[model samples]
Target chain A: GQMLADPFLNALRKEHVPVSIYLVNGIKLQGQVESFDQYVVLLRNTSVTQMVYKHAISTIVPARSVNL
Target chain B: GQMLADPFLNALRKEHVPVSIYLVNGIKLQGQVESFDQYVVLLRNTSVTQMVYKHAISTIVPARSVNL
Candidate 1:
């Protein structure tokens, strides 16, 4: 079953939209959301595939706002 | 439409349990989930409701891990 944050994540996954991830400390990150589960998300920025723990994340902003 | 995060949030709201919100820098924040839009969540400490902008938040921790 898809969880609370999954839709937004999956939408981006489906669209391959680039996004801005704002951490709690004010640093901004950009990536494409790849896949997720209970604790981690596979994010990518071209050549790199990064794994981000859910606990350290803030808000995710799409490059263009996803039409919900 | 039932959004992605709404279920977890709505579940907590239905259960009335305190959730710990972990921010980026130092620690976890305390509150009961009330409501949210794309930009903010209505957080409450017992009785006083606080609106927290989504950007500065990190993660939401439930008091008890609920069944998915």
Candidate 2:
């Protein structure tokens, strides 16, 4: 877990990767990650910005990494 | 997001799938789901039990679904 997450988050921090955050309630938010921590994430879209709690997130997939 | 989450959780509920939950702090917990909601997940592994918050999770992959 640590092995995969550390590098993954670091890459996002360094590259400002576009990501799709999937939530437990079946919502998806797309944005570039501005910042994140143990409890929340700050995401930025074109003119919109949102802060999401970690608990609500089901997954954060890098946009470019999706094969399908 | 809703499309994926609804079915995934239902499958876990109905089938009692084993899952690997990856956390933000680089921890991985493996267990069968006892129950879950938008805020928390209850997992049981043998003689151990754990309740995890949604904010801590990065992803939950079905154990049998892991390809590598």
Top lDDT model: 1
Q: What is the TM-score of each predicted model, taking all chains together?
A: 0.50, 0.47
- Model 2 lDDT tens row, B1-68: 11234445556656877877766776778888788776888888998778898767765666443111
Shift in Å, residue A34, candidate 1: 1.0
User: What TM value does model 2 have?
Assistant: 0.47
TM-score of chain A of each: 0.81, 0.78
lDDT of 2 by residue, A11-36 (tens): 77568778888877566778787655
lDDT at residue B55 of model 2 (Cα atoms): 65
Root-mean-square deviation per candidate: 10.2, 13.2
| Superposition-based RMSD of candidate 1 using all C-alpha atoms, in angstroms | 10.2
Question: Which residue pairs show collisions in model 1?
Answer: A4-B4, A4-B5
